[PDB]
Amino acid sequence: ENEEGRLIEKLLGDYDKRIIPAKTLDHIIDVTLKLTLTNLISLNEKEEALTTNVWIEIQWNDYRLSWNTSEYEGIDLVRIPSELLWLPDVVLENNVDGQFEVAYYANVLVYNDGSMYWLPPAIYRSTCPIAVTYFPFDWQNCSLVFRSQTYNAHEVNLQLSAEEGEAVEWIHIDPEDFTENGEWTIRHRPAKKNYNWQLTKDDTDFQEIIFFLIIQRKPLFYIINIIAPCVLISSLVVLVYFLPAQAGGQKCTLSISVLLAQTIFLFLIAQKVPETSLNVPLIGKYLIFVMFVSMLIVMNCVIVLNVSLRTPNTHSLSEKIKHLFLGFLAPEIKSCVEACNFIAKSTKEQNDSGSENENWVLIGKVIDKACFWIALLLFSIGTLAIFLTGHFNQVPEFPFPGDPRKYVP
Amino acid sequence: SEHETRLVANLLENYNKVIRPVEHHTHFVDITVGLQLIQLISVDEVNQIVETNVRLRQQWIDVRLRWNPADYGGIKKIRLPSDDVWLPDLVLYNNADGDFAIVHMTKLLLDYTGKIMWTPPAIFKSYCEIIVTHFPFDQQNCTMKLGIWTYDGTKVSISPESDRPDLSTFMESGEWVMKDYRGWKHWVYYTCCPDTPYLDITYHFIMQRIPLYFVVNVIIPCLLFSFLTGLVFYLPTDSGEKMTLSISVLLSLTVFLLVIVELIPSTSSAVPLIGKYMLFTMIFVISSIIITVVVINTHHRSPSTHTMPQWVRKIFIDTIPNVMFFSTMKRPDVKSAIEGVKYIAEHMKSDEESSNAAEEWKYVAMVIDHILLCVFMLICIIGTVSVFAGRLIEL
Amino acid sequence: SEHETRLVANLLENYNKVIRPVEHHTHFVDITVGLQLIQLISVDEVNQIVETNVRLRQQWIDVRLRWNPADYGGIKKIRLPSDDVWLPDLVLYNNADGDFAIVHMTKLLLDYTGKIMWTPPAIFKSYCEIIVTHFPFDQQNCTMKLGIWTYDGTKVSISPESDRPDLSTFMESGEWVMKDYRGWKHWVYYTCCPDTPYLDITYHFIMQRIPLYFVVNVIIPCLLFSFLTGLVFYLPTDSGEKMTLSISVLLSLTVFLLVIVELIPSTSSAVPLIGKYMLFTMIFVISSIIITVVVINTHHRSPSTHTMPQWVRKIFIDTIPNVMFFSTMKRPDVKSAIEGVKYIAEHMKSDEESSNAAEEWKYVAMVIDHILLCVFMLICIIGTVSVFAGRLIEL
Amino acid sequence: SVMEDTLLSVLFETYNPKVRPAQTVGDKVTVRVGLTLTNLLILNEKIEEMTTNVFLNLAWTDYRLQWDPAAYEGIKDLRIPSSDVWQPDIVLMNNNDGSFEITLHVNVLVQHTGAVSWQPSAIYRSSCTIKVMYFPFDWQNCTMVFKSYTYDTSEVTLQHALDAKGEREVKEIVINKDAFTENGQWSIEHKPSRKNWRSDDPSYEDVTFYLIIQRKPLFYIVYTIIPCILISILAILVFYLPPDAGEKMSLSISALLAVTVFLLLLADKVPETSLSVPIIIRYLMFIMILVAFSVILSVVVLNLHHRSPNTHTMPNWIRQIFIETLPPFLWIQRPQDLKEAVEAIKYIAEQLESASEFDDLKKDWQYVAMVADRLFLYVFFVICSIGTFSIFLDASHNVPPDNPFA
Amino acid sequence: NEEERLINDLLIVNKYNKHVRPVKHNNEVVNIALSLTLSNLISLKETDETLTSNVWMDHAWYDHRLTWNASEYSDISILRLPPELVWIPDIVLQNNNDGQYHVAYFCNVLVRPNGYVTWLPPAIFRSSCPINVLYFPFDWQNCSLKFTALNYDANEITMDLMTDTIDGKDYPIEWIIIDPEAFTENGEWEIIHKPAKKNIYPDKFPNGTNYQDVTFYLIIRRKPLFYVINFITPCVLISFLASLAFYLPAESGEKMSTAISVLLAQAVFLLLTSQRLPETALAVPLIGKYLMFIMSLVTGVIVNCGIVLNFHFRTPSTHVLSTRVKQIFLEKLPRILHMSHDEIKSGIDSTNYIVKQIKEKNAYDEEVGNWNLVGQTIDRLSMFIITPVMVLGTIFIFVMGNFNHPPAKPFEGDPFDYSSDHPRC
Ligand SMILES: *[C@@H]1O[C@H](CO)[C@@H](O)[C@H](O)[C@H]1NC(C)=O
């Protein structure tokens, strides 16, 4: 027969899983945590939640579950379901949903010296407040806060697992099996034990283990689907200055159509940005900038059309403006002759009116050239600055600014 | 620990968890209730639901769970599963669609004097009367009502732990500001009988919305469209683009209606502030389009069919142009040949007369455009200020 | 059945289900694991999650559960609740967001020799690397890794039932075609110790997308818009609608970009094929608009302020039109009256000269339009073929 | 009552609910499987899932639950909680989620003869493949497969349920008029039931309930088809607009915008399967291509209208086709000072004559444009009418068969 | 605490079996009186036709086993027992959507010394009620909550409406109970009627679970403000803008642009409206009828603008202005519509030729002007014929919508108000 049966029936007989295994008064149970990251499933900006698949390793000593191997044919390791044993109530505190516990309650590995090794896998959804300032050229700093929801610092002592005498102060990632998220890349992954000094060694919240994930976005999707089309469409507003300023030129058509396309892009971006209202995202800043510039260019096109279509009758072209712009910048015979003279006079007058119209058109063209140069410079500088601020938004070199250590294996 | 194992075995040997912890059935258990707000997960204006992550701190004394520490190796406190002992059934009276009572049966702390401390976590989804009159500059006041479901005040009495909820460890929302918070205890009696009070504790949190997301995402585009609305009046009618421009502004606003519909709450209790503003913008654009159509019709009036009324000439050609200071607008075969030349000359007479009349019509249209540009810029500014500044000054 | 009642009573009286079913603790339990794929529920490209409906067949011997049929009326097989006996803890190692282990504890079939057959159902939501490079003509290789969580290979050994998953009762997907499927067993050792193998079985399925939905609903409208943007160059400048047509095509493409972002996955690992084609179409339309503006500017070129450069005339008026074979393009008061007539004649002369110069500019613009029409039709065809032909030929 | 307590204690002293009730080794338990449809909630086509609210009318015989009513004050039947008796693991096998079992465990009815009756309620989400070819003018064939998850044909024998006064089997889904809500989008045409075996596997047997349901397409008719018809009318009308108005491109390209907007509207409603193209999408693509061709021909007509002798020379074939032949078919059918003054007048006359000839040639080009535009008007009207009528009759001839075949 | 002894006597010493009905003889019927209190109406999202509500189920029955003499113990006049210890009547919402038949929170029961047991568990219920879209958004819905006892047949337990007393006479509570103070009105819906009924089905049999029923009805009216503000008024104004196309001169080449843009905006409004309603096909919603009518009318306006432009641009070189057309569109309709030495010989020949050319050009121009006048007359007629149709159709449609109040009395054949103010007798 299986000796494990006799051994386990002996161990669990007269065993109370409600009772912390503190050997005596003032004995503190050491619980060591080691987090392994299997998959970074996603980071939902709308919900401000990070979903991860982790294997959390919890180790402690339970003196009641020790045995002498010589009495059980050298058995030194048994598996007992975790629901039969006392467990330290290590839970994820900063969970968005009400899921504090692990997902699968694996068996606990129990060694003959009382050492207990529990490796339950878990799917966790933790709160990650989103820094939207540089979205989509942003990096986030998410944390997983672990603490015991039952016992305080007088009863348990949360520590980071130590391997071969060196503290494992980082999230463990197996190089081969780990798969890149596809939207996020992990730059730093430190772990440290934290204290809430506002509390005393009671309250169960005094101590905690925090695992940090400093992740950088890969903005290829946004660049290809929103940024580049938006920039190309918005740059079209500088073309209005080369269209003729009369009916059929279609200055207003082009400018207002570009503005309408930018409105469509505003609707498109409204569905991606997080709803928090502490900062304006970089992409939103750029859309506002281009919309304002397009409004200005529509105004300038309207002004140019008004200037170019002026007539001697509605407006008078004062010589000051001309200098300013075109500078620094038988009775039958009697009746027949009367008719001929009147014809010549009318033709002369019409030609003169035409000439004045052409003067106004030239003034309009000069204004077009000047405003084109101004608008090209403005648009180029604004776009370059806005999308160069994001390119220089780099993750800090160190996981903790003032800490020299790199926190890597 | 063998001492603690023996203690726990002895405490629950003859313990009935359905009986109240009172020495005599006429007494009442006194429970100190405290609420610890940890996070404001979300507010749903359409469904009037406020979701919060809280801890419900409950303290009371169970006389049946005493022991002498000297008999148990000096043990003074233990942790017990909450399912092992009598618990008070505190229920969120104004629950919307969450859980009515505590579902996370966490462990509780028990002193050797019977004093019990229990702080289970919970997610409260409460019914929140939302007021959208001043959206997005709106302040919301809504509560969490708590009480013992099945016991009256003569069996189980609940008293608040402090004067207000504990927000010591409250995560900052990023969308709301906790202006104030407090908790009040109420005694409710019924016509039955005045000897059976019914107690509850209401915690209310006054929240102020942070109006930046909605500002930049809704109000600013509305301002651009409003500003462009009156721009059409400076555009001359000769360029066949007055209707193009105004109608494109209207289409842009109609497309933006999608953004508003998907962003602002869909309640029907009252009209939001931005709802009034956007309706104003719509009517503004439509009026501009109507008057632009009128002006275009006026500009193209032909002398042959329409003759200028005297009052139109008197007003728009003589009076108003004088009082427009900003504008720079001004204020054998020989007999056949001879007969043909005369005919040409008289035809030019007629052409010049018709051209002059059409020019007068065009001038009147231009004057109307200038007046309308002034009026519409003024109306835009006045309407925006009237809609917004009234609420903005109060802040 | 009284016989079976007695059998079940005598068969679990002293049965501990926490203990492994081995006669001696140095032996191992040999479990035959087989996977049966019933249905491919969905493939989530954004989160890289594949949802499958499977039956996880498991077979092993439990010597403690054997009986002699002659003592129970010849009963040879009974059904027991799976939660009554020891079960192997098979876990889906690459679970994304589902259950890690079996949760539906269905009954198992127990044979009188101790042989057990357990086939619980499951929904596997497994993480798998999605490669969107040839989307929608993409082939995916998504796996299911299974293994015993808490036992090594010396205590519990799993071996595949067969070398392939069972797809006998598979449901045709309607979106994916199952190219291939296989299962492999791996031995994994650690620097600890080479006497403790850790076993896992990996099942992988090669899936080919059926690219009809995406073709019709995305690619065809893009082709249509590309064709129209090419067409813009045949529209004469006199009809003041070149900008209307080109910018309306751009607006249609923007609305369709909205549609695409609604449909296509939002991955970011690499640019899909549809992404490259959409970007190419956008750049195509933008270049078309720019060159259309250039042509319009050239057409309305004032001869008063501009004079045609000699090279422009040499190229566009003399040589280029000759090589365009398919085209149909061309290859007292009497003194005052006399002076007035002379003035009319000389003004007609000047107007004729100006008109000739303007007509020359218009001819140059029309020739440029012909050249660009040919060029842009060629570019549209070439780019459309280039983006897709490599993948289409690979299939 | 006290006697009910005594009877229950007597019945369940040694009763084991884990053991299937068989008098003798080798006996099979006959299980009658019936279904009552209370509400056909949804037929989500995006996920190919039908949600229904049903009752399972199960009946079998348990020889262990037998008693003499004379000895128990004439107690003829008991209502025993369903978990205290053996029950067959009748489940829905073709479920889309992982929910095989019932939701509400109503207690069983046990009669003194050993006849057990159980009518649990459930909200089931079954998976039925959608034939997306005539959508939204389509009928679907969604099934619900019920069998024992554990026991096979060597252990239980599935049968059809009996009617209220059990005399003959009921081979259909039962619908209780007192409690039944019409879907409002689906009409139930047939609802048969049948037992199915498998030739390869002799231990398999199930009872399948088939729902043949026809969609009511009013919503889609209005919200997609009517606007498409109006847009097609505009696309035809573009060819009646004179080229001088400068509005052809606006009309045609705006029609194209409208069609793509309707495609955006329809995106989130059509099933995403690739076995076929739904008829509505085919109609949208036909209208889209028709509008695109209207745009192309409008561009061609505008190009023809704005030609002049200064740029183009009119070829003989164009003149013959568009001026001689087509019009009748389309019903169009159209002293130094004195010498200087004399020279000036002569020059003016020559200029007028040249302008007259130039204008005549331009008018020839414009007439060609007019004739081509009329021809395109007629051709597009005919094509649009024929195509729309063909597609709509094809859609309207799609009806479920008279015989369900099940 | 005497309660411990009393409860031990009730449940353990007497051997209380919670799986057995509280009847002394197995032929009597247990009467369960139940009532419903509506804590708050959460939602009636019409897309999937689900009514979410927070309700408190009130239960009351007698249990002769839970009786005691209050004097034999201390004067204990009431007990609180968990429902898992006593017999409970399983009353389930039959017409639920999500698969939740039971109450949310199994609270304690209250027991008096005479065996009277009251149970008041709260619940969140998601019932299915079909949506009548006929007058959307001026519609009122009639949603129902149907409760059945599926654990026992009618011969074993009888469901009844709870009763209350005012002045010594008890009456049934035939309505949903709403607490005027605690209840907060829903954002979108107003409650008009709230009857309660016990339904018998005589075509079934008492020895079945489909024979009895207790139904609570909620006749609620939508508050049409969100839709009036955001959907109807902008659409109505944009549609009225289509009539201005006729007042816009043909010289301004923007008639078609205006009409087509109005049509595009109406298509956007159609897209917006399509998402707000279920896919049912019982009827076309009022807003849908209006959108269809107005879109058809605007398409007619576009066609008529196209015809007018075709008329305006005819010339003598391509069309003939017949006498019939001239009389109709220049005399009758404008009145009805109240509308507003060889060198000298060569010189002489040249001037004669010039004069002839000018005369021909003048005739051409005047006939072009005649065509322009014909186009203007057609515009005026079209406006006079279409603007009144548009205005009258809009007014009629929306006053029909605004005249759709609920019947003011549920159960058409019933003269009872089912109002909490006037209980029967
Ligand atoms: C374990 O048991 C063996 C007998 O099998 C004994 O010799 C040995 O001393 C025991 N170990 C200890 C630490 O006492």
Chain E residue numbers touching B294 (CB-CB < 8 A): 247
Alpha carbon distance C186, A176 (integer Å): 15
Looking up tokens 């009234």, which residue turns up?
B390
Looking up tokens 């036992």, which residue turns up?
C151
Chain A within 8 Å of B104 (Cβ-Cβ)?
yes
Chain A within 8 Å of B63 (Cβ-Cβ)?
no
CB B143 within 8 A of CB B46: no
Alpha carbon distance E116, E111 (integer Å): 6
Alpha carbon distance D54, D161 (integer Å): 15
CB A82 within 8 A of CB A106: yes
Chain E residue numbers touching B296 (CB-CB < 8 A): 248-249, 252, 254
CB B106 within 8 A of CB B48: no
DSSP H or E run through B59: strand B49-61
The candidate with the shortest Cα–Cα distance to D251, out of C248, E390, C227, is C248
Tokens of C52: 């499958």
Alpha carbon distance C32, E313 (integer Å): 87
What is the β-pairing status of strands A29-44 and A156-160? Answer: parallel
- Fill in the amino acid letter for C309: P
Query: Between the CA atoms of C213, C218, C221 and C227, what dihedral angle is there, to the nearest 10 degrees?
Result: -120
CB E410 within 8 A of CB E195: yes
Alpha carbon distance E119, E61 (integer Å): 9
Looking up tokens 């110790």, which residue turns up?
C193
Total residues belonging to chain C: 395
3-state helix, strand and coil shares in percent for chain E, rounded to the nearest 5: 35, 20, 40
Classified as helix, coil or strand, C343 is helix
What are D55's strand-pairing partners?
D36, D121
Biggest CA-to-CA distance, chain B: 152
A130 contacts: CB under 8 Å, gap ≥ 6 = A45, A48, A138, A140, A274, A276
Q: What are phi and psi of B28, to 5 degrees?
A: -125, 150
Classified as helix, coil or strand, C192 is coil
Domain that holds residue A92: 3-220
Q: What are phi and psi of B57, to 5 degrees?
A: -80, 120
Looking up tokens 């260019």, which residue turns up?
A297
What 8-state DSSP symbol labels residue A395? P
**Per the omega criterion (within 30 degrees of 0), is the bond before B136 cis?**
yes
Q: Indicate the top mutation candidate among A3, A10, A69, A70 to test ligand 1's pocket, ranked by most ligand atoms within 8 A of CB.
A: A70
CB B354 within 8 A of CB B346: no
E-strand stretches of A191-288: 191-195, 207-217
Helix B242-263 crosses helix B220-229 at what angle (to 10 degrees)? 160
- In this structure, what CATH number is given to the domain that contains residue D74? 2.70.170.10
Alpha carbon distance E239, E266 (integer Å): 7
What is the β-pairing status of strands A184-188 and C176-190? Answer: unpaired
The candidate with the shortest Cα–Cα distance to C169, out of C43, C63, C35, C49, is C35
Ligand 1 atom at shortest distance from the alpha carbon of A71: 5
Alpha carbon distance E311, E314 (integer Å): 6
Q: Do C259 and D260 touch (CB under 8 A)?
A: yes
- Chain E residues 393-422 with CB within 8 Å of chain D: none
Q: Do C171 and D129 touch (CB under 8 A)?
A: yes
| CATH 1.20.58.390 placement within chain C | 213-394
Alpha carbon distance E120, E35 (integer Å): 9
The candidate with the shortest Cα–Cα distance to E373, out of E422, E327, E342, E423, is E327
Alpha carbon distance A346, A348 (integer Å): 5
Alpha carbon distance C354, C340 (integer Å): 21
- What is the separation of C-alpha A27 from the centre of its chain, rounded to a whole number of angstroms? 46
Q: Which residues line ligand 1 (CB under 6 A)?
A: A 68, 70-71
- For residue A331, CA distances in Å to A334, A339, A344 come to 5, 12, 20
**Chains contacting chain D through 3 or more C-beta pairs under 8 A:** C, E
CA A11 to ligand 1 centroid distance, Å? 17
Alpha carbon distance A306, D77 (integer Å): 96
- For residue C333, CA distances in Å to B105, D8, E350 come to 118, 139, 22
- In this structure, what CATH number is given to the domain that contains residue A70? 2.70.170.10
Alpha carbon distance E253, C54 (integer Å): 66
Neighbour tally for E225: CB within 10 Å: 16
- Take atom 12 of ligand 1 and give the residue whose Cα is closest: A68
List, as one string, the DSSP characters of B68-121: -GGGGTT--EEEEEGGGS----EEETTBSSS-SS-----EEEEETTSEEEE--E
Looking up tokens 């939204």, which residue turns up?
D136
If phi over 0 gives left and psi between -120 and 50 gives alpha, with beta otherwise, what is residue A160? beta
Alpha carbon distance A67, A113 (integer Å): 7
Ligand 1 atom at shortest distance from the alpha carbon of A68: 1
Sign of CA dihedral E371, E376, E380, E385: positive
What number of CA atoms fall less than 13 Å from residue D400's CA on the CB side? 21
| CATH 2.70.170.10 placement within chain C | 2-212
Min Cα separation E182/chain D (Å) = 33
Alpha carbon distance D33, D159 (integer Å): 6
Buried b (16+ CB within 10 A) or exposed e, B363-387: bbbbbbbbebbeebbebbeebbeeb
- Fill in the amino acid letter for E363: A
What is the β-pairing status of strands E116-119 and E109-111? Answer: antiparallel
3-state helix, strand and coil shares in percent for chain D, rounded to the nearest 5: 40, 25, 35
With vertex at residue D205, the alpha carbon angle to CA D203 and CA D209, rounded to the nearest 5 degrees, is: 165
DSSP H or E run through A38: strand A29-44
**B37-41, Cβ contacts within 8 angstroms, sequence gap of 24 or more:** B37/B165, B37/B166, B37/B167, B37/B170, B37/B181, B37/B205, B38/B169, B38/B170, B38/B171, B39/A127, B39/B170, B39/B171, B39/B173, B40/B170, B40/B171, B40/B173, B40/B176, B40/B205, B40/B207, B41/A96, B41/B123
Q: What are phi and psi of A47, to 5 degrees?
A: -85, -10
- Fill in the amino acid letter for B179: K
Alpha carbon distance E45, E48 (integer Å): 7
- What is the separation of C-alpha D395 from the centre of its chain, rounded to a whole number of angstroms? 11
CB-CB: which of C91, C268, C337 is closest to A218? C268
The candidate with the shortest Cα–Cα distance to A300, out of A252, A262, A253, is A252
Tokens of C274: 């549809």
Classified as helix, coil or strand, E68 is coil
Distance between first and last Cα of chain C: 61
**Per the omega criterion (within 30 degrees of 0), is the bond before D81 cis?**
no
CB A159 within 8 A of CB A31: yes
CB D46 within 8 A of CB D65: no
Chain B within 8 Å of A319 (Cβ-Cβ)?
no
CA A76 to ligand 1 centroid distance, Å? 14
CB-CB: which of E128, E279, E313 is closest to D242? E313
CB A407 within 8 A of CB A171: no
CB A98 within 8 A of CB A247: no
CB C383 within 8 A of CB C237: no
Sign of CA dihedral D212, D218, D222, D223: negative
Q: Indicate the top mutation candidate among A68, A69, A72 to test ligand 1's pocket, ranked by most ligand atoms within 8 A of CB.
A: A68
Chain A within 8 Å of C297 (Cβ-Cβ)?
yes
CB B253 within 8 A of CB B282: yes
Chain B residue numbers touching E107 (CB-CB < 8 A): 89, 91, 149-150
Q: Do B344 and E355 touch (CB under 8 A)?
A: yes
Buried b (16+ CB within 10 A) or exposed e, B1-19: bebbbbbbeebbeeeeebb
D26 contacts: CB under 8 Å, gap ≥ 6 = none
List, as one string, the DSSP characters of E349-411: HHHHHHHHHHHHHHHHHHHHHHHHHHHHHHHHHHHHHHHHHHHHHHHHHHHHHHT----SSSS
Alpha carbon distance C143, D262 (integer Å): 40
Q: Do C19 and A109 touch (CB under 8 A)?
A: no
Helix A251-270 crosses helix A282-308 at what angle (to 10 degrees)? 170
Q: What is the dotted CATH code of the domain comprising C213-394?
A: 1.20.58.390
The candidate with the shortest Cα–Cα distance to D307, out of B170, C234, E111, A180, is C234
| Domain covering E2-225 assigned CATH 3.40.50.10490 in the classification | no
Tokens of E398: 């929306």
Q: Fold for domain C2-212? A: Acetylcholine Binding Protein; Chain: A, (2.70.170)
- Chain E residues 354-383 with CB within 8 Å of chain D: 354, 357
Q: Do D262 and E267 touch (CB under 8 A)?
A: yes
What 8-state DSSP symbol labels residue B172? P
- Fill in the amino acid letter for D62: D
Q: Exposure of B389 by Cβ count < 10 A (0-12 exposed, 13-18 middle, 19+ buried)?
A: exposed
Alpha carbon distance B40, B171 (integer Å): 8
Looking up tokens 């970074």, which residue turns up?
A40
- For residue A285, CA distances in Å to A190, A314, A385 come to 33, 42, 11
Alpha carbon distance C78, D151 (integer Å): 10
Question: Mind spelling out the 3-state secondary structure of B273-337?
Answer: HHHHHHHHHHHHHHHHHHHHHHHHHHHCCCCCCCCCCHHHHHHHHHHHHHHCCCCCECCCHHHHH
Chain A residue numbers touching B65 (CB-CB < 8 A): none
The candidate with the shortest Cα–Cα distance to A315, out of B357, B355, B236, is B236
CB A141 within 8 A of CB A126: no
What 8-state DSSP symbol labels residue B216? I
CB-CB: which of D150, D264, D277 is closest to C259? D264
Radius of gyration of chain C (CA): 39
Neighbour tally for D363: CB within 10 Å: 14
E-strand stretches of E169-231: 170-172, 189-193, 196-198, 214-222
What 8-state DSSP symbol labels residue A312? T
Question: Mind spelling out the 3-state secondary structure of D82-135?
Answer: HHHCCCCCEEECCECCCCCCCCECCCEEEECCCEEEECCEEEEEEECCCCCCCC
Classified as helix, coil or strand, B250 is helix
CB E139 within 8 A of CB E133: yes
B369 contacts: CB under 8 Å, gap ≥ 6 = B233, B234, B236, B237, B295
Alpha carbon distance B109, C354 (integer Å): 102
CB E243 within 8 A of CB E271: no
The candidate with the shortest Cα–Cα distance to C22, out of C65, C56, C70, is C65
